[PDB]
């Protein structure tokens, strides 16, 4: 059948998020944690089969997905013997470096998902090494489409995409929290302030998405002469909002590079 | 019939946006611009009846909507004789001040919409003076629901809501532009960078909306220990993203207060 | 064809006379002292008056070229009897009526130094005594040394910053580009030639195009390129905030004058 | 005395010089990042396309490169060049270009800007040791067709890139800042922008035709106890000059690292 068996090594927050989307596929799933005790425990919570070891996982599966953090790739992967294509979700680790940990004869793929996988709206980058066929990439693209959208991104752009899509949800939340806290400062209860700004963020992003106008086109439209919005906007300029965000993205990329 | 005749005095960007939603109602619409030449010209563009003067507008209508900027309220309104309930969309002008321009015997309402009215997803505050009945408020709430959602907000909170919902779209766009420009700095074409971040902003806001978790709960989930996201987040802290946004909201509110 | 008189002729007033010489009107000037009047009249190839009042009695229209802080001192002891045009920053039509009279049509202009090449961007406005006749005759005057903007008086201080003061900010900006050129190995004259020509062309491109400045910025910023690196440095150090705060200060000063 | 000129990579900048190239006697042909893209671009620009880069190279007297600097190595090494080549790329020296395309070719660099769209680019031009008097003169006619041309030595190219290639973006951010200051203070954006754009245009024209320096002009415009001097000292306070200089330095750093 089109159905394959997929094993996941390391199941934390990001891997847990993509499981939900993977349950909506025909495929069979099996997991493997940091200890056997931990594996049973999360297999409990997710209602899925667990493996007795990572090698035990590897020996029965058609495709492996790696959910461990990048700092543990060498330690965890080198002692193992892989036998199928592997997908890494890890920031900062190239396909070339993965091949040294895992083997030069394996088709290897990289994805860069985000926590919006939780609602099947991840914005996920996908790329493969020279051993990945058209058909295999398409099969994996089916997997990524199950928990959001999929972007065909060159590997040389993966670190930048990690910042724009992978990490940015946190920056978006801090920004949202900032508007809401400012509502609190100024008289509006937190829950109410959050509801208003979250709905406004949603609507503003849809409006941009479906319009041919740029972000600056909208800003010109919204800033009435001598109005309240231009006052707030020049305060954003004075305090360096744009420089702040961009510097943050630079730091994110720098970290991805050093990993 | 339930249908009324509604006249709009001053039709710029914000008033143009709410027309689309008002066309989806049973009601009859008529507009009135800055000059008769301008009125014909925009009635042309919107495919609607225009009035020969503001008084000409006032004499045939069941409800007036004011789309002029706050700085022109005194100049434009005092010479006129109003005969029906009026809705003001203007930032910074209380119902009490409007009554001095327009009359102490009129039911008066305030709304605070945003440019997302363009896609019928405005987040709109609504309030009325002591002359507004339950039935009239409900009829006007029907109007506001035609171009988005409606919030029952005390007038004392209108200036803060103006900042959180009315002006914030511009701040959201500048923030989005900042992420996208940072993608450009780092190798990703503008259009592509915008597509990725706009979709991520959309998805992140839906995820927050439908979840019981706070923005900081999500941030903890997204920040892997020693990872790329915590690096970028501490850079946002170092450069004062939260203080920046909040100071901007303060400036927005200050301007609303001085108007 | 009227006889037009100018009281006070410094930098701005001198720049404006080149354009006025190309109108059919007759001109006469009056300075800070008889000697100064003659010195100035010689170099402009124009007649001069023996005193401000002597100027006033023979002239259809007065143009004021003195600094705002001299308006009271210089105008109060005179007796005007024509429409007056003020080019002064900070001085309202209302305040001027206080110095010269409540029965006079009074206009304000706000030109800039580009009058020298007849390309000033000049705001024009008048009080309640100004017919659509008079505003027309005066608009012909201002079109002689550039373009004319019908600007309401409430917007004059801002126009003053945007068109009147801004040439100096533009020049500091150009100078900064050229100094940056010098710092990095290109001679001052050559860098200034390059930059001036680039500013000139850029603004011509913007003017004839339907695209916004930010649209052009998007076209110019190649992904991973040099321009986006420089642009984000400008954002880091606050170019936009800095210009805006300078404009606010210009407007604050206009207000307090 | 007419060449055929071929163009490899056609983005914003390359599309901008076409208009001037069309006013020349020379024949033109293009080649993009795929055959599908070549035809879309040919459609938009009303110009012949080649079936591939080598196909372009094989039938052409001169090659102009409009690809990004980051792509030179990947795109140029596999090909076999057979004629003089003009690069418009930031940051890549003639010496480095020769390692990608061969040591036996006359090679030239230009540095234009987006004002080529209206035939008013400020374009630097330089050639390697293999470029003749006559060839550079022929290239000078090419760049003269979309603006002015500056004979500048290559050691000065990264600085020229910043002053003339990148600077229009800095000029527009400045104009935009002036226009937004207008909006903040009650004047509509379109109106504000019309006023400042016209002022920048006239100011730069006055400077060009005067013998006075920018600082001379500043002295003229700053009436004692006036509004301009107050704004000027605010620019000084907040560091306008050092800000522009620092951006130029960063533009040049980037060109160096490319
Ligand atoms: N979080 C995000 O929003 C995000 C977004 C995009 C990409 N990513 C990528 O996703 C990957 C995981 O990130 P995360 O945030 O999910 O990290 P996390 O929450 O810390 O999850 C890592 C998991 O791996 C487990 N683990 C530790 N040692 C192991 C080993 N010996 N063998 C098997 N499993 C082991 C840990 O188990 P215990 O709990 O028992 O210690 C933990 O649950 C990273 O590579 C990151 O680059 C994350
Ligand atoms: N823009 C927003 O995102 C936003 C958001 C929330 C609330 N608001 C509120 O909405 C109101 C309008 O803002 P806006 O951004 O739409 O401003 P705008 O774009 O400048 O529109 C104002 C319009 O009123 C017209 N007008 C001027 N004088 C008039 C008079 N004599 N009689 C009738 N009409 C006249 C102008 O006509 P001409 O074009 O011919 O000059 C202009 O089209 C403001 O009160 C503001 O507080 C705006
Ligand atoms: N400069 C600009 O770029 C600019 C731009 C737009 C608007 N403006 C406005 O234009 C006006 C002129 O400014 P400016 O920069 O041209 O100043 P300026 O060069 O210093 O001119 C002032 C002139 O007034 C003369 N004056 C002094 N006392 C006088 C008196 N008692 N009677 C008659 N004339 C007297 C001075 O004569 P002496 O030379 O003998 O001292 C001097 O020539 C100001 O009101 C300013 O706000 C200036
Ligand atoms: N932008 C400026 O104002 C400016 C000013 C002076 C000099 N420059 C220089 O001009 C060059 C291009 O800049 P730009 O702003 O025009 O960048 P751009 O718009 O991104 O153009 C680069 C073009 O190269 C194409 N391309 C990608 N891969 C290719 C390949 N495999 N073979 C052939 N063509 C390929 C791209 O096609 P697709 O669209 O199909 O991907 C794109 O259209 C740069 O080297 C830069 O240093 C730029
Ligand atoms: Na790395
Ligand atoms: Na107020
Ligand atoms: Na004043
Ligand atoms: Na370089």
UniProtKB/TrEMBL annotation, chain C:
Pathway(s) the chain acts in: Amino-acid biosynthesis; L-proline biosynthesis; L-proline from L-glutamate 5-semialdehyde: step 1/1
Function: Catalyzes the reduction of 1-pyrroline-5-carboxylate (PCA) to L-proline.
Keywords: Amino-acid biosynthesis, Cytoplasm, NADP, Nucleotide-binding, Oxidoreductase, Proline biosynthesis
Residues binding NADP(+): 7-12, 32, 36, 52, 66, 89, 219, 222
GO cellular-component term (any): cytoplasm
Organism of origin: Streptococcus pyogenes serotype M1
Single GO MF annotation: pyrroline-5-carboxylate reductase activity
Localization per record: Cytoplasm
Main location per the UniProt record: cytoplasm
The organism's taxonomic lineage, starting at the top: Bacteria, Bacillati, Bacillota, Bacilli, Lactobacillales
PANTHER family: PYRROLINE-5-CARBOXYLATE REDUCTASE (PTHR11645), PYRROLINE-5-CARBOXYLATE REDUCTASE 3 (PTHR11645:SF0)
One GO term of the biological process aspect: L-proline biosynthetic process
Identification of the protein by name: Pyrroline-5-carboxylate reductase
Annotated EC: 1.5.1.2
Record keyword Secreted present: no
Record-linked Gene3D superfamilies: NAD(P)-binding Rossmann-like Domain, ProC C-terminal domain-like
TrEMBL record, chain D:
UniProt pathway annotation: Amino-acid biosynthesis; L-proline biosynthesis; L-proline from L-glutamate 5-semialdehyde: step 1/1
Enzyme class: oxidoreductase
Signal peptide: none
Domain Pyrroline-5-carboxylate reductase dimerisation: 154-258
EC code: 1.5.1.2
One function term, GO molecular function aspect: nucleotide binding
InterPro entries: 6-PGluconate_DH-like_C_sf (IPR008927), NAD(P)-bd_dom_sf (IPR036291), P5C_Rdtase_cat_N (IPR028939), P5CR_dimer (IPR029036), Pyrroline-COOH_reductase (IPR000304)
Key word Magnesium present: no
Residues that hold NADP(+) according to the record: 8-13, 33, 37, 53, 67, 90, 220, 223
Organism domain of life: Bacteria
Keywords in alphabetical order: Amino-acid biosynthesis, Cytoplasm, NADP, Nucleotide-binding, Oxidoreductase, Proline biosynthesis
GO biological process terms on file: L-proline biosynthetic process
Keyword Cytoplasm: yes
Location of this chain's protein in the cell: Cytoplasm
Domain Pyrroline-5-carboxylate reductase catalytic N-terminal: 4-91
Catalyzed reaction equations: L-proline + NADP(+) = (S)-1-pyrroline-5-carboxylate + NADPH + 2 H(+); L-proline + NAD(+) = (S)-1-pyrroline-5-carboxylate + NADH + 2 H(+)
Similarity comment: Belongs to the pyrroline-5-carboxylate reductase family.
Known function: Catalyzes the reduction of 1-pyrroline-5-carboxylate (PCA) to L-proline.
Listed name of the protein: Pyrroline-5-carboxylate reductase
Organism of provenance: Streptococcus pyogenes serotype M1
Taxonomic lineage of the native organism: Bacteria, Bacillati, Bacillota, Bacilli, Lactobacillales
Gene giving rise to this polypeptide: proC
């Amino acid at each position: 059948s089109n159905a394959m068996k997929i094993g996941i090594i390391g199941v934390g927050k990001m891997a847990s998020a993509i499981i939900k989307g993977l349950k909506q596929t025909p495929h069979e799933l099996i997991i493997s944690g940091s200890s056997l005790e931990r594996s049973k425990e999360i297999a409990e919570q997710l209602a899925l089969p667990y493996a007795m070891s990572h090698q035990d996982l590897i020996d029965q599966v058609d495709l492996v997905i790696l959910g461990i953090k990048p700092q543990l790739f060498e330690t965890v992967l080198k002692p193992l013997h892989f036998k199928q294509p592997i997908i890494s979700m890890a920031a900062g680790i190239s396909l070339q470096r993965l091949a040294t940990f895992v083997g030069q004869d394996l088709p290897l793929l990289r994805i860069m998902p985000n926590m919006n996988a939780q609602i099947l709206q991840s914005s996920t980058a996908l790329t493969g090494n020279a051993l990945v066929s058209q058909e295999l990439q398409a099969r994996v693209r089916d997997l990524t489409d199950s928990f959001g959208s999929t972007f065909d991104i060159s590997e040389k752009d993966f670190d930048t995409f990690t910042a724009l899509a992978g990490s940015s949800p946190a920056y978006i939340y801090l920004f949202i929290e900032a508007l809401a806290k400012a509502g609190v400062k100024n008289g509006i209860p937190k829950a109410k302030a959050l509801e208003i700004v979250t709905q406004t963020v949603l609507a503003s992003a849809s409006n941009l998405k479906t319009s041919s106008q740029s972000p600056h086109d909208f800003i010109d439209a919204i800033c009435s002469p001598g109005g309240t919005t231009i006052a707030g906007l020049m305060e954003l300029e004075r305090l360096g909002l744009t420089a702040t965000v961009s510097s943050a993205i630079d730091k994110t990329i720098d970290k991805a590079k050093s990993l």
